Amino acid sequence: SGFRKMAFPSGKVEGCMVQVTCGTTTLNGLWLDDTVYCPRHVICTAEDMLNPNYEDLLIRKSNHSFLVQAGNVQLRVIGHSMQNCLLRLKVDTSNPKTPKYKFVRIQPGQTFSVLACYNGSPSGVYQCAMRPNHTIKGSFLNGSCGSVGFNIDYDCVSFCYMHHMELPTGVHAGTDLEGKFYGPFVDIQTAQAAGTDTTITLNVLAWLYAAVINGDRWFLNRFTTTLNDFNLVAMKYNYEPLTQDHVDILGPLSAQTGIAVLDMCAALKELLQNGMNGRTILGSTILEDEFTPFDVVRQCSGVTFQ
Ligand SMILES: O=C[C@H](Cc1cnc[nH]1)NC[C@H]1C[C@@H]2CCCC[C@H]2CN1C(=O)c1ccc(-c2ccccc2)cc1
């Protein structure tokens, strides 16, 4: 029993973190095979960041303008190219700890684990969701750029995030591993701000199913709702509209608990209208939205408690 935010074991990623230095900037890169991936702003000073031109900044560097460290070993760069917002550096050695892996662009609402690194050295791990406004509520200090996000299935690591910047509200933005930002953000130190965010409805429902699988049913009710009357209520409380594809996604959880997804939407609609009356769900006093349906099935018993 119990339900916690849970990150994937981080060993396979820890064996890929390195340190990358260009001039006086140092940050983290990701060493798979014979490439090292890192934020392309490692080639910038503080002042360049106001208005950089990366193409023009990069033609000015050589292979030996980049220093790559892996533990105590110096790795020798033999090639470099820019890919959108990342650099790929080719190094003279193939990472012997490279895991089976793939690169994925995750979609708002999905979750992943982040290995926070400083100077190529892993310091912590936590789980977070991609918000609808394309930020994440990370925990990151200066020097954490190049820290990655990932999911693990079987033995295969799906890398899906690289950390590039922190926004004024204290949220974090970054890219996939082909260098394309998540959201409307760019690697320029120019006024930028998180767009308004929304509660991830699919996840709240998934988490209410969790609560039922463990054995708690206090927040259910006798009512059902149409999809459409749900949404009139959802918008008013700044929840994402529920779509039929989100309803189909919840099928398995609906089936494990015998609660119909709309019936759960009526449960939620009533939670939104009345509060929780000082009660809790899975230990929380507030509706939680950073567990996906897949996160609930992965963590919960396949046998409902009742
Ligand atoms: O390496 C980590 C940081 C990101 C981060 C820090 N804390 C959590 N995450 N890298 C931020 C870098 C690069 C980034 C690229 C996108 C546009 C914003 C920049 C911000 N970065 C700077 O180098 C930077 C640091 C400090 C200031 C600053 C300091 C004092 C007053 C105003 C600005 C401006 C830029």
Swiss-Prot record:
Cytoplasmic side: 1-306
Subcellular location(s) per record: Host cytoplasm; Host Golgi apparatus
Catalytic residues (UniProt): 41, 145
Quaternary structure, from the entry: Monomer. Homodimer. Only the homodimer shows catalytic activity.
Peptidase C30 domain span: 1-306
Name listed for the protein in its UniProt record: 3C-like proteinase nsp5
Function statement: Cleaves the C-terminus of replicase polyprotein at 11 sites. Recognizes substrates containing the core sequence [ILMVF]-Q-|-[SGACN]. May cleave human NLRP1 in lung epithelial cells, thereby activating the NLRP1 inflammasome pathway. Also able to bind an ADP-ribose-1''-phosphate (ADRP). May cleave host ATP6V1G1 thereby modifying host vacuoles intracellular pH.
Organism placement in taxonomy: Viruses, Riboviria, Orthornavirae, Pisuviricota, Pisoniviricetes
Shown residues in whole-protein numbering: 3241 to 3546 of 7073
Catalytic activity line of the entry: TSAVLQ-|-SGFRK-NH2 and SGVTFQ-|-GKFKK the two peptides corresponding to the two self-cleavage sites of the SARS 3C-like proteinase are the two most reactive peptide substrates. The enzyme exhibits a strong preference for substrates containing Gln at P1 position and Leu at P2 position
Source taxon at top rank: Viruses
